[PDB]
Amino acid sequence: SQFTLYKNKDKSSAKTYPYFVDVQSDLLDNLNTRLVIPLTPIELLDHLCPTIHIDEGDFIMLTQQMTSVPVKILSEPVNELSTFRNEIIAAIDFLITGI
Amino acid sequence: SQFTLYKNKDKSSAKTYPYFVDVQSDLLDNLNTRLVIPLTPIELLDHLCPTIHIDEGDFIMLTQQMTSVPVKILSEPVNELSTFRNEIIAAIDFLITGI
Known part of the structure; x- marks a missing residue:
């Protein structure tokens, strides 16, 4: 569902972008892709980028790194x-x- | 500038997505990335996806494939x-x- 947070399992990027949020409207769930935005731990970043406070930690949402990914890569909500x-x-x- | 159309030179994708449109606000030009949306020739696709009519041809804008790319890859406006x-x-x- 839109706004679900998934654990990133991509080996190259997980350590910088541990989670992705699905931001795509659920009306478009028929598509085989989802627009997502990565979160990065706030400590890593030394308006456009919301700070997000959740059980997983304190994160910055890197809106400018938004990208379309295959729905198949989204796991562990x-x-x-x-x-x-x-x-x-x-x-x-x-x-x-x-x- | 936002809305500029660039010729895609990526070898794997150029034949499907010959052009990218920069859709990112010019206020954010300081960033090293740009949000872009690919265009595909209308003949290739057998509301969400505007049809675009320009000297280069008739295209469908594949909004769902929007993605952030490095500004360095954008060339030939x-x-x-x-x-x-x-x-x-x-x-x-x-x-x-x-x-």
């Missing part, structure tokens, strides 16, 4: 970020439409 | 799609917020 939907949607809006 | 901005933005809105 550790959490979901729907209560933060307003901030997430606003960040995507900012990436595309600015101020 | 054959065209720009700003007159179609409303339809492009609406398609992205649909991918994220549905109806």
